[PDB]
Amino acid sequence: KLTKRMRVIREKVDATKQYDINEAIALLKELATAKFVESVDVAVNLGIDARKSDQNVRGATVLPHGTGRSVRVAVFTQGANAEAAKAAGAELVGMEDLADQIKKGEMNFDVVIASPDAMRVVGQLGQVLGPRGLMPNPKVGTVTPNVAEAVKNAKAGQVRYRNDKNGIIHTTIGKVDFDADKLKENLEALLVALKKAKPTQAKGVYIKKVSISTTMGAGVAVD
Amino acid sequence: MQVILLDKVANLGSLGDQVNVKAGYARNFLVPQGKAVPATKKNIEFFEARRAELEAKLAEVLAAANARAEKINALETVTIASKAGDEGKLFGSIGTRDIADAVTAAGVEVAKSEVRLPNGVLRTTGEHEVSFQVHSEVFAKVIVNVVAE
Amino acid sequence: SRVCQVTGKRPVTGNNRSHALNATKRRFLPNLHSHRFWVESEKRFVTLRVSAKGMRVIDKKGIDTVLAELRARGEKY
RNA sequence: CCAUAGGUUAAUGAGGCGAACCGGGGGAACUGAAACAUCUAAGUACCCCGAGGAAAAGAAAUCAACCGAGAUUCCCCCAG
RNA sequence: GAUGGGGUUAGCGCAAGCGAAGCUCUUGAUCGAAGCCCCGGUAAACGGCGGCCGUAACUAUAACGGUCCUAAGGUAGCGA
RNA sequence: UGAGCCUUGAUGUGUAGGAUAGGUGGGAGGCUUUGAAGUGUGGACGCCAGUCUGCAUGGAGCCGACCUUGAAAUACCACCCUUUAAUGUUUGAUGUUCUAACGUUGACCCGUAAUCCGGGUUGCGGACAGUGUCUGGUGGGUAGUUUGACUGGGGCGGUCU
RNA sequence: GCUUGACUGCGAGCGUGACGGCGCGAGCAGGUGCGAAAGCAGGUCAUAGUGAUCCGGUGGUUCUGAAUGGAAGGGCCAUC
RNA sequence: AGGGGCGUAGUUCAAUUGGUAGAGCACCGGUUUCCAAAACCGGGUGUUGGGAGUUCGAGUCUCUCCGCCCCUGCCA
Ligand SMILES: [Mg+2]
Ligand SMILES: [Mg+2]
Ligand SMILES: [Mg+2]
Ligand SMILES: [Mg+2]
Ligand SMILES: [Mg+2]
Ligand SMILES: [Mg+2]
């Protein structure tokens, strides 16, 4: 049934047992077996379940190491914030024209940032940006008066996360070619932000399991 | 309830095998039927003492076995004669009776049973290679020279 | 009577309580059982009225040792 | 089958009585609480067992508090 | 006795504080029968056997019912 | 025969549609004589639409990839979620085959001038029954009590701040 | 229209109750609000909208901490 | 208190279990026969207790706002 490519992947990783961060990151570097450069895919299970409305978590984190995942930033803002956004390196800055370009189907951006005054225009794009999860939300810091900082903070390696229905976290710390030590710092910085996001009523281990995997790599548990 | 086996009760093992077992089991079955005894400090030392006693017994019976062995192994060739057997046709055989006395030479007594004569009943005249079994593991060796009357 | 021949346990009295702590007099009796103990020296079975706690001490102390103490008290068998 | 149970003798000892006191095994209710359940009365009355002129207890796995005391019993305080 | 929370302190810390191991206080996952809930039966088991409305060739009455409560509303016989 | 997890397999129709398109990322890939597509029933299930791959056969093809679509696909993976199925791990639940505890108000022998008792022999039952501790339920069977006052006597009615 | 005085510590002197208690209070201290200010504000036009103590719960607190350091527990404050 | 539970057309009770609330009888009509009654249809009857989330979209899942429940439980 399984081909030789798939069988060697599961031969390299024995996921039936847990592994320590030091060993886990070593395994991740040896799992990079693809024609194209891969990106680490986080597989963290939370004991808390989003089936309770108040237990939902939305957060953001800027990573110094970065991820490489495309970061084209479209900015909805007016006035001095538009110049500050351009000076901060925003690829697209506009309001109604850029919204109408989006309505015309020009979607050459990966991240939308909006000023609170621009929320009126971005709200009209809710049918387009909403299902794709690109809609700016204050809880992730993408709706801010300090538009230049949001453009900055993003660019490099700002990553977003939103809990699913099964209470699982599927983020990305960065590319696979990143150094093991940097990747460990990357996930560690992510982990502390999750602890802050944790509520209180949740009478369960915040994380049900921490695992890491690449594009075609197997899941190695982290301890 | 530690108890020292006296036989091969079921799967518990065999004679002389301390094993942990539920109290009731021994409290009313092994002991009143005599199949075992508690392996208590006092009893266990007596047990091990009897064990070592029989062990040294085996040592001696095998130590004295090598004694008889060497006594007769190293050369100790015999040349006793009896009937009118000569050369060519040695005529008669030498069997459990005369052979035992021969190797014994009024000393190294080896039972007539052990006189394992492999090459038939040694009818031809000449050099003959005869072994003895003083003990089950001891493989003794003797050379017998047959001479005419 | 309900007296253990090994440990000497006998009925004792206490109170039945309740959620209102009402106290009514009661009796606590030992977990006595008539058992036939195998005495090796006489190769015989001797029946004793023993408590469940008494059964535990018989294994620890030995069948002969416990009987020796009973003979000091002095009784029939 | 030995044995054991059992049986027959012979030696000793115990039996019962007696006031309170003492130790132990059991152990109320009336009453008080202005009723009444917890509680009180009370481990009292009473019953049973055992002992003595006394009994019981008794020679620290005790107290103290960083200083020390040195078995048990009894009295006065501590203290309502 | 799963898990979680406290207390204590080896240690680390200028100290703020943190906290190993151990002991300890607690929280009570899991297991858990009858019973109860539930499903039937049983009245020579304890027991129960009402109202409302309409309807006969005159009236009347209501068999012929219908309706509600109820579980179901008194038969034979007897009856100031 | 239970209830568990562990792993694996399988399972994911409101619809548009590629339609047996869980959940969420990763993901432009995918992908591979090592059985390319295929071709033949291994298919069993299922919506009977479809799905996974006895294995044999053939030898590089295979496929992210529009549109609608939540929507982009059992093409891509961690591995999980549901439906679960098997597999590994644990307590129990009965049934049975036992005897050795225990029971015998079965038979026989002795103590023994004995329908008691004890011992022995044997049979039957048997890890039950029965008993102890703890515990749920039931329990006028038996106890200890309560069951107010004002009031043109009391009760009834009414009243009590 | 603006606001939180429905303020905190107190309180001269009175009222009404057998008492437990209840009620009124200028003024003082600290911080407020509204006014430009004088000033007003310690809930509501007033008089009903309520329940003592014990016990337990919660927060705060250098008060206590049964050898000592803690802690438990207790006390005090807030409060159920 | 704590753990299970339920509140859909005037009459009750099904469901869906995110995509989609019927039947019951009462009522008015229509059929059916020579005609009546019985039967057979049409149809007029709904916010799935209520409120807010979650959602592309939920009477459905969740949080609950409650009423009415069954089990179970506690010393102002
Ligand atoms: Mg009284
Ligand atoms: Mg005297
Ligand atoms: Mg008359
Ligand atoms: Mg009384
Ligand atoms: Mg009166
Ligand atoms: Mg006003």
Side-chain angles (χ1 to χ4, degrees), chain B residues 55-133:
Chain B
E55 190 166 359
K57 298 292 182 56
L58 163 75
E60 173 274 302
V61 70
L62 178 55
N66 292 5
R68 321 171 46 79
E70 287 296 348
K71 277 287 305 175
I72 190 171
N73 187 6
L75 278 299
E76 210 290 327
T77 71
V78 288
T79 176
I80 316 297
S82 179
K83 187 55 177 70
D86 298 356
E87 58 87 13
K89 297 170 287 303
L90 181 58
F91 273 122
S93 298
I94 58 149
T96 58
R97 302 208 316 178
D98 53 0
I99 309 180
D101 307 336
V103 288
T104 301
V108 195
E109 173 64 293
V110 181
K112 302 178 298 301
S113 300
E114 308 296 331
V115 188
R116 296 308 187 269
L117 306 159
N119 60 2
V121 74
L122 192 154
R123 322 198 182 180
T124 314
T125 187
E127 166 48 34
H128 281 269
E129 177 272 330
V130 185
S131 314
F132 297 92
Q133 291 299 117

Side-chain angles (χ1 to χ4, degrees), chain A:
Chain A
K1 183 188 58 180
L2 297 174
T3 70
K4 183 178 179 180
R5 177 74 273 171
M6 292 177 72
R7 294 183 181 277
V8 67
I9 296 169
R10 44 147 296 281
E11 272 274 316
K12 293 179 179 179
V13 171
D14 186 74
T16 58
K17 65 182 181 180
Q18 287 70 240
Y19 301 102
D20 50 278
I21 192 160
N22 192 24
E23 290 183 0
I25 205 70
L27 286 169
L28 188 151
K29 188 180 179 180
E30 184 178 2
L31 293 179
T33 46
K35 320 176 183 302
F36 73 111
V37 54
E38 317 181 34
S39 181
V40 182
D41 184 35
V42 181
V44 171
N45 202 13
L46 301 180
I48 81 169
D49 293 338
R51 182 177 182 170
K52 288 193 183 304
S53 176
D54 54 356
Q55 282 174 354
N56 205 5
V57 285
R58 293 182 183 174
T61 301
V62 184
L63 278 299
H65 322 277
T67 60
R69 179 75 274 172
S70 48
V71 296
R72 295 172 296 171
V73 181
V75 180
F76 291 90
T77 191
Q78 294 183 347
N81 285 343
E83 296 182 352
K86 288 181 182 179
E91 291 79 5
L92 298 173
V93 185
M95 283 277 278
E96 297 185 348
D97 304 324
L98 195 158
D100 287 346
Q101 285 176 352
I102 288 169
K103 288 172 193 159
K104 289 172 184 177
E106 293 190 351
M107 288 180 282
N108 291 330
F109 53 87
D110 301 279
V111 161
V112 186
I113 300 174
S115 65
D117 51 307
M119 287 293 293
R120 188 180 72 121
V121 181
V122 178
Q124 299 183 348
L125 303 176
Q127 294 186 356
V128 182
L129 298 180
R132 296 185 176 213
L134 294 178
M135 192 176 187
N137 187 314
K139 295 188 176 188
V140 298
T142 62
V143 183
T144 179
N146 291 354
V147 182
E149 190 186 351
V151 175
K152 286 180 180 182
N153 296 17
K155 186 64 69 177
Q158 189 174 252
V159 302
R160 207 181 177 180
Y161 64 92
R162 183 194 65 119
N163 202 10
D164 65 343
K165 293 179 179 179
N166 300 129
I168 300 174
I169 299 296
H170 296 287
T171 58
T172 178
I173 65 185
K175 281 304 185 175
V176 71
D177 292 332
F178 273 74
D179 289 345
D181 296 352
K182 307 187 312 179
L183 281 182
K184 148 179 180 56
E185 305 306 317
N186 195 311
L187 66 88
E188 181 59 46
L190 176 74
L191 211 43
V192 304
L194 277 59
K195 300 156 192 172
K196 308 164 191 174
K198 171 188 182 176
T200 183
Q201 171 68 4
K203 198 179 182 178
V205 194
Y206 178 57
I207 49 183
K208 200 145 46 193
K209 171 190 177 180
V210 174
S211 176
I212 48 179
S213 159
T214 70
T215 298
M216 212 170 48
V220 175
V222 192
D223 296 330

Side-chain angles (χ1 to χ4, degrees), chain B residues 1 23 27-28 31-32, chain C residues 35 38 45 55-56 59:
Chain B
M1 187 61 267
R27 188 162 37 186
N28 294 296
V31 184
Chain C
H35 198 90
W38 170 256
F45 269 109
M55 299 275 307
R56 293 183 79 243
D59 297 337

